[PDB]
C-alpha cells in the first residue's frame, strides 16, 4: 500500500540535498540526449540543403560535445544517486536497530530472531535497491516525456501538438496496465512465500513425514499451492504480454501520424524536413526509456512487502520503560517480595501465573520446582522485569520492581537464561560481560567456581580460546558453566538461575552450589529446576502447578507435606 511511500518521505528527507542534484543531472542528461538528434536534424536542414560539408563537420564537433556533456552528467547523476541510496539504507538500518533494541523479550518472541534479522538485513537492502533504481533508471521515462514535449514545443508551435496529444495516451495506457498488474504481483509474492514455507517445512520434517506416511496429503497440498501460484502467474503474464505491444503500437501510430501531418505542412512550407528526423528520434527515445522503466518496475511489490514488514517492526513501541523517575537505592539486596503476582497474555483462558506470593531474606537461597508448562519459566523474567505483571506486585527491598531503575536492576541482577547462548569470539571476551573490566585471575577463579577450570586450562592456548556463535563449538552444559562464570564474576546481590543446572550432572551441580555458598553466601540465589537433587539443599522451596503455588517449605517437610512434590520424589527415586 502506501507504507513504502510514508517510510520514504520520512527517511530520505535528509537527502534532499542530494536527490535534487540527481534529478537535475538526469534532466540535463536527457535534454542533451534530445539535443543530440535535434542538431542531427539541423545537419540535414542546413548542411544537406546547402550542401556544405563543413557545416556537417562542425555540427559533428557539436554532436560530440553534446554527447560528452551527456555522459559526464549522467555518470555524475548515477554516482550521486548511489550515494543517496546507500545513505538512505544506512539510516534505515541504524533506525531499525536502535528502535528494536528498545524491545523486551516479549516483542522479540513476537517477531522471532531469524525473522527480525532477515527483515533488518534483506528487506532494507531491497528497499535501497529500489530507491537507487528509481533515482537512476526509472525516472528516465517521465523526464524523457517532459523533455520530449518541451523540445517539441521548442522546435515549433505547430506539429508539436501531435506529440503533446500522443504522449499522454501512452502514459495513461501504462498507468492502466500497472494499476491492474500491481495487486497481481503482490499476490504473486504472497504465494511465493507460501510455497517456500511449504517446501521448508517439508524438507525440515522428511523423517517425520515418511514416518506418518502423510504423502497423499503433502502431495495434494503442494499441488494446490503450485496451481494457485500458476493461476497468479497466468494472471500476471496476461498484463505483462499486454505491456510491450501497446507501447510499441502507440509509438508507431504516433510516428505514422507524424509523417502524415508533417508532409502537409512541409508542402505549404511551414515545416522543414529535418524536424521529421528529430521527432522520430524523440519518439524512439521515448519508447526505449518507457519500456526500460516499466520493465524495471517489477521491483515495486518487493519494496511494498518489505516496507510492510519494516512498518510492522517500527510501529510496535515497547511496553517496558523506566517511569521517568524511578528510585535509586544503589544498595539493593535480596528481598524479592512477591505478593499476589499475576501474569497472562491477552486473550488467554488460564493465566500464565496467578496469586503467588513468597519472600526471601537478604542472603537466603531459594528454589522453585514444578512440571513443565506450569509457568515457572516466565517467573524469572517477571523478577528481572523482562515481562511486567498483569495485576500482581513483587517488590525488592520493599519497593515494587516497576518502580526501580531498570538499568541499575540489571546491573545488580546476575541471570543465566534457559537458552544458554554465547557471542562469537572467545571465552576471555564473552565472560567479560559480567564486569567488562575483569582481571585474568578473577576469570580463572570464576572458572574454578563454575566447575569449568579443568577444560579451559586443558586448551593449549589458554583461557583465551575461540568460540563460535552460541557456543555451538562446545559439547553442551559447558555453555551453562560458562554462563555461570559470567554471572559469578559480576558478584550480583541477587542470583537468577533458570534450569541451567539441568544440563549438568549431579556432582558438577553439587560442586557449583558448594562454590556458590562459599563465595556468594551474602548474596541471595534463586534457582529454577526440574531436578530434586539440585533443590534439596536450598533454604526454602516453593512448588507451583498451573500457575499457582501448591507447596511452600523445606525439602524435609515438603517430602511428606504435599503429594504433589511427592510425585517428583517418587519419580526421582530408584
Amino acid at each position: 500500500s502506501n507504507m513504502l511511500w510514508a517510510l520514504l518521505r520520512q527517511y530520505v528527507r535528509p537527502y534532499r540535498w542530494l536527490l535534487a542534484v540527481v534529478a537535475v543531472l538526469q534532466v540535463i542528461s536527457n535534454m542533451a540526449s534530445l539535443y543530440l538528434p535535434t542538431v542531427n536534424a539541423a545537419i540535414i536542414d542546413d548542411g544537406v540543403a546547402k550542401g556544405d560539408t563543413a557545416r556537417i563537420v562542425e555540427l559533428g564537433a557539436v554532436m560530440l560535445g553534446v554527447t560528452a556533456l551527456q555522459v559526464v552528467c549522467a555518470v555524475g547523476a548515477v554516482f550521486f544517486g548511489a550515494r543517496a541510496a546507500t545513505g538512505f539504507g544506512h539510516d534505515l538500518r541504524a533506525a531499525v536497530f536502535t528502535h528494536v533494541t528498545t524491545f523486551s523479550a516479549e516483542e522479540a518472541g513476537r517477531f522471532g530472531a531469524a525473522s527480525l534479522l532477515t527483515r533488518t538485513t534483506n528487506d532494507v537492502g531491497h528497499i535501497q535497491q529500489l530507491v537507487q533504481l528509481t533515482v537512476t533508471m526509472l525516472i528516465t521515462a517521465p523526464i524523457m516525456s517532459i523533455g520530449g514535449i518541451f523540445m517539441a514545443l521548442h522546435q515549433d508551435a505547430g506539429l508539436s501538438w501531435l506529440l503533446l496529444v500522443s504522449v499522454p495516451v501512452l502514459g495513461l495506457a501504462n498507468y492502466w496496465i500497472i494499476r491492474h498488474l500491481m495487486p497481481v504481483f503482490t499476490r504473486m509474492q504472497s504465494l511465493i512465500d507460501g510455497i517456500n514455507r511449504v517446501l521448508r517445512d517439508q524438507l525440515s520434517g522428511i523423517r517425520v513425514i515418511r514416518a506418518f506416511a502423510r504423502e497423499p496429503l503433502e502431495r495434494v497440498r503442494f499441488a494446490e499451492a503450485n496451481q494457485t501460484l500458476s493461476d497468479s502467474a497466468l494472471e500476471a503474464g496476461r498484463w505483462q504480454a499486454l505491456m510491450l505491444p501497446v507501447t510499441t503500437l502507440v509509438i508507431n501510430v504516433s510516428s505514422v501520424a507524424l509523417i502524415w501531418f508533417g508532409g502537409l505542412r512541409i508542402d505549404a512550407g511551414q515545416m522543414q524536413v529535418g524536424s521529421l528526423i528529430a521527432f522520430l528520434a524523440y519518439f524512439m527515445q521515448i519508447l526505449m526509456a518507457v519500456l526500460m522503466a516499466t520493465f524495471m518496475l517489477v521491483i515495486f511489490p518487493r519494496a511494498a512487502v518489505c516496507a510492510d514488514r519494516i512498518g510492522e517492526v517500527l510501529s510496535t513501541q515497547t511496553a517496558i520503560t523506566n517511569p521517568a523517575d524511578p528510585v535509586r537505592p544503589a544498595a539493593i539486596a535480596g528481598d524479592i517480595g512477591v505478593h499476589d503476582a499475576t501474569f497472562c497474555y491477552p486473550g488467554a483462558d488460564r493465566p500464565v501465573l496467578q496469586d503467588v506470593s513468597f519472600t526471601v531474606p537478604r542472603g537466603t537461597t531459594t528454589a522453585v520446582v514444578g512440571s513443565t508448562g506450569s509457568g515457572k519459566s516466565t517467573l524469572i523474567s517477571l523478577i528481572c522485569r523482562l515481562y511486567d505483571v498483569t495485576s500482581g506486585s513483587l517488590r525488592i527491598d520493599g519497593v515494587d520492581v516497576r518502580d526501580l531503575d531498570i538499568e541499575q536492576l540489571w546491573s545488580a541482577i546476575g541471570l543465566v537464561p534457559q537458552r544458554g547462548y554465547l557471542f562469537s569470539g572467545t571465552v576471555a571476551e564473552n565472560l567479560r560481560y559480567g564486569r567488562a573490566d575483569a582481571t585474568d585471575d578473577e576469570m580463572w577463579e570464576a572458572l574454578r567456581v563454575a566447575a569449568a577450570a579443568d577444560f579451559v586450562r586443558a586448551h593449549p592456548q589458554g583461557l583465551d580460546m575461540p568460540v563460535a556463535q552460541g557456543g555451538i563449538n562446545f559439547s553442551g552444559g559447558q555453555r551453562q558453566r560458562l554462563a555461570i562464570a559470567r554471572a559469578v564474576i559480576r558478584r550480583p546481590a541477587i542470583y537468577l538461575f533458570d534450569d541451567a543446572f539441568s544440563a549438568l550432572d549431579v556432582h558438577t551441580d553439587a560442586r557449583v552450589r558448594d562454590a556458590l555458598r562459599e563465595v556468594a553466601a551474602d548474596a541471595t540465589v534463586v534457582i529454577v529446576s526440574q531436578r530434586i537433587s539440585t533443590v534439596i539443599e536450598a533454604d526454602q522451596v516453593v512448588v507451583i502447578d498451573d500457575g499457582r503455588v501448591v507447596g511452600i517449605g523445606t525439602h524435609d517437610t515438603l517430602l511428606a507435606d504435599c503429594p504433589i512434590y511427592a510425585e517428583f520424589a517418587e519419580s526421582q527415586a530408584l
Partner: protein, 619 residues
C-alpha cells in the same frame, strides 16, 4: 560460478521442446514480428523520401530533365547540391502526390498493427508454455523429494538442499521467463537490423558495429574493476549479518548486563563501513549502462556525420538515412542490458544444472507392495552391523528380543547410535549383514509405507510446520475430529498450557508465542504421535526437555497402561524408565547386557555403575 553451460542450456531447452509445434509456432510469430517491425522503418523512410523529392523538386523549373536540372545547378556552382540532385530521383517541377504517400503510410500503419498483434499473441503463448513447463518441473522436484532416500538429505549442509529446491527454482523462473522473451527478441532484432542495414549501406554498418567489440570490452573491464569491491561488499554485509545474529539471538543476554551501548556502537561503526563499501561497489556496478550508452551515442554521431556526407555526395537517399538513424537506436537498445541478460542467464544456467543434478540422483528401491501388518507386536534383531559409511560399524551384532506388549527400554551414552537404531527400525537406512523382523516376518520383504503407517515414532528433536497447534496435532490423522484431538491433547497434557497461549489450539506455531519452549513442543509432537493410535510406539528421547514427573505420568498413561501394544522407551534418566519390562545397555553399538531393573542392577553392570555413580555424586 558455473560448470556446465551447453549441457544445462540444452536440458533447460528440452524442458520446453515437448511443446514442439507450440514452441516452433511461438518462434515463428516472434521472428515474423521482429522482421515486420524492422521493415516498417524502411517504408517510413521511403515515404519521407517521396515527400522530400516532392518538396525540393518545386524550385527547379518544370519540364526539365533531371540531368538537365543537375547540369543547370552545377554550371552556376552548387557542386554538392548538384551531386545531391544527381543521386536523388525527382522529376523537376512536380509536387507531392498525396495518394502515394497515403498508400505508403496506410501500409505502414497496417503492418505496425499486425506486428503488435503478433507480438502480443507470441508473448501470451510463451507465458503459457513457460508457466506450464515450470509447474511440471516444480512438481517433478516435489515428487523427487518424496522419492529420495534419507541418506541424501542427511549427507549435506542443512541449508544447501533447501536453497537448491526453493531459491534456485525462483532464480530459474526470474531467469528463463525473462530471457526466452527479451533476449530472443533482442537477438532477432539485431540480426534483422544488421541484414537490413547491410542492404542499406556497408560503411554505415561498419561505423555502427564497431561499438560491439567496444561495448563488450568496456563491460568486461568494468566488471573486472568492480569485482574486488563487490567481494568486499559481500564480506562486509556478511559481517554485519553475523553481528546482527549474535546481538539478536542472545538479546536477553544483551539487555542483561547493560551492554546495549557497546553493541550499538560496534553496529554503527560496521554499518558506516558497509555504507561506504556498498556505495563504492554499487556505483561501480551501476555505471555500466552510461558507458555503453555513450559508446553507442558516439557511434550515432559517426552515423549522422557520414550519412550527411554521403547524402551530400548523393550515393544514398534521405529516407534510407532516416531508417538507419532509427535502426542504430533499435540496435543500441539491446546492448544497454545485454550484460544484464548474460549474467542472469548464467545464474539461471548454474541453478538449472544444480537442480538437474538433484533430480538425477538415486531414489528408493521400488518398495514391493507386500502390504504386511502387525498383529501382536513382536520384534527381533539379528546381528545387524549398519554403518553410515564403511569403516564405522556404529551398530554391531545386536540380538535384542522383545515379546508383544513389552515396554523394553535401552540405555546408552549420547551419540552411541540410538537414533541410527530407530532409523533402521524405520527402514530409513538399509540393513547391513543383519536381519530384523516384526512379528516374525522380515521388514525387508515388507512395503515401507505400510510399515511406517503402523509404527508411530518420535525423535530426539521436535518438528513443527506452519499452522495452528490444532493442525499440528491433527497431522497424525487428518480425518479425525476435534473431540478426538482434545482427547489426545488431554492424554498428552498439552492442555495444561495450551489455554495459557493467546488462543488455544489456534496459535501459529511458526509465530513463536514466547511461552512455547522446547519441552512443550516435544509434548505437541508426542500428542501428534498419540493421535495416530500406533501399535509399535518408539520413544527416542522424546522427553528430554520436560520434567521427569510429566514423563512418568504420560508413560504410565499411554505405554504401561496400554498393555495391548509394545513400546520402545529411550531416555537419559534411569528413573524415567525404571521398571519398564527389561532394559538394554548399549555402548556405541555392541549391545552389552539385558535384563529387568532389579536383575540388571544386581549383576553390577554398567547400568549399575551409572545408577550408583550419578545418584551418589561420585566422580
Amino acid at each position: 560460478r558455473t560448470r556446465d553451460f551447453k549441457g544445462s542450456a540444452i536440458r533447460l531447452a528440452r524442458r520446453l521442446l515437448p511443446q514442439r509445434a507450440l514452441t516452433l509456432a511461438v518462434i515463428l510469430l516472434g521472428v515474423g514480428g521482429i522482421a515486420i517491425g524492422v521493415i516498417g522503418p524502411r517504408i517510413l523512410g521511403h515515404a519521407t523520401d517521396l515527400l522530400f523529392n516532392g518538396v525540393i523538386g518545386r524550385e527547379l523549373p518544370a519540364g526539365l530533365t533531371k540531368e538537365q536540372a543537375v547540369e543547370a545547378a552545377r554550371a552556376r556552382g552548387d557542386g554538392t547540391f548538384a551531386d545531391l540532385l544527381s543521386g536523388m530521383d525527382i522529376v523537376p517541377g512536380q509536387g507531392v502526390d498525396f495518394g502515394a504517400v497515403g498508400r505508403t503510410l496506410a501500409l505502414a500503419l497496417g503492418l505496425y498493427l499486425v506486428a503488435a498483434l503478433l507480438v502480443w499473441v507470441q508473448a501470451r503463448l510463451l507465458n503459457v508454455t513457460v508457466q506450464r513447463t515450470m509447474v511440471a518441473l516444480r512438481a517433478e522436484v516435489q515428487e523427487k523429494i518424496h522419492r529420495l532416500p534419507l541418506s541424501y538429505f542427511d549427507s549435506r549442509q542443512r541449508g544447501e538442499v533447501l536453497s537448491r529446491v526453493t531459491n534456485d527454482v525462483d532464480n530459474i523462473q526470474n531467469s528463463v521467463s525473462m530471457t526466452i522473451s527479451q533476449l530472443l527478441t533482442s537477438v532477432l532484432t539485431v540480426f534483422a537490423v544488421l541484414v537490413m542495414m547491410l542492404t542499406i549501406s556497408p560503411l554505415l554498418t561498419l561505423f555502427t558495429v564497431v561499438t560491439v567489440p567496444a561495448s563488450l570490452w568496456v563491460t568486461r573491464w568494468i566488471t573486472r574493476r568492480s569485482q574486488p569491491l563487490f567481494v568486499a561488499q559481500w564480506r562486509n554485509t556478511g559481517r554485519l549479518a553475523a553481528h546482527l545474529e549474535e546481538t539478536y539471538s542472545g538479546f536477553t543476554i544483551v539487555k542483561t548486563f547493560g551492554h546495549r551501548e557497546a553493541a550499538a556502537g560496534k553496529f554503527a561503526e560496521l554499518n558506516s563501513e558497509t555504507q561506504q563499501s556498498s556505495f563504492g561497489a554499487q556505483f561501480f556496478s551501476g555505471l555500466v549502462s552510461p558507458a555503453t550508452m555513450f559508446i553507442g551515442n558516439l557511434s550515432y554521431v559517426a552515423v549522422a556525420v557520414v550519412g550527411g556526407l554521403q547524402v551530400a555526395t548523393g550515393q544514398i537517399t534521405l529516407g534510407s538515412i532516416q531508417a538507419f538513424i532509427q535502426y542504430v537506436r533499435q540496435f543500441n537498445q539491446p546492448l544497454t542490458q545485454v550484460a544484464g541478460m548474460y549474467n542472469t542467464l548464467q545464474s539461471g544456467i548454474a541453478s538449472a544444472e544444480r537442480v538437474f543434478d538433484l533430480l538425477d540422483t538415486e531414489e528408493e528401491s521400488a518398495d514391493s507392495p507386500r502390504r504386511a501388518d502387525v498383529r501382536t507386536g513382536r520384534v527381533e534383531f539379528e546381528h545387524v552391523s549398519f554403518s553410515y559409511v564403511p569403516g564405522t560399524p556404529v551398530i554391531e551384532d545386536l540380538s535384542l528380543v522383545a515379546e508383544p506388549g513389552s515396554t523394553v527400554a535401552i540405555v546408552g551414552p549420547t551419540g552411541a547410535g540410538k537414533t541410527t537404531l530407530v532409523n533402521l527400525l524405520m527402514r530409513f537406512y538399509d540393513v547391513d549383514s543383519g536381519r530384523i523382523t516384526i512379528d516374525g516376518v522380515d521388514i525387508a520383504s515388507v512395503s515401507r509405507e505400510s510399515l511406517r503407517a503402523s509404527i508411530g515414532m518420535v525423535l530426539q528433536d521436535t518438528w513443527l510446520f506452519a499452522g495452528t497447534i490444532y493442525d499440528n496435532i491433527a497431522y497424525g490423522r487428518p480425518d479425525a475430529d476435534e473431540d478426538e484431538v482434545i482427547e489426545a491433547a488431554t492424554a498428552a497434557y498439552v492442555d495444561r498450557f495450551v489455554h495459557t497461549l493467546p488462543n488455544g489450539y489456534d496459535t501459529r506455531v511458526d509465530d513463536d508465542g514466547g511461552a512455547i519452549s522446547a519441552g512443550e513442543k516435544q509434548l505437541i509432537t508426542i500428542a501428534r504421535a498419540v493421535l495416530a493410535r500406533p501399535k509399535l510406539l518408539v520413544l527416542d528421547e522424546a522427553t528430554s526437555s520436560v520434567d521427569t514427573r510429566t514423563e512418568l505420568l504420560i508413560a504410565h498413561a499411554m505405554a504401561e497402561l496400554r498393555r495391548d501394544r509394545t513400546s520402545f522407551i529411550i531416555a537419559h534418566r534411569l528413573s524415567t524408565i525404571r521398571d519398564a519390562d527389561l532394559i538394554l545397555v548399549m555402548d556405541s553399538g555392541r549391545i552389552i547386557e539385558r535384563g529387568t531393573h532389579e536383575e540388571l542392577l544386581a549383576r553390577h553392570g554398567r547400568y549399575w555403575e551409572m545408577t550408583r555413580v550419578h545418584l551418589g555424586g561420585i566422580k
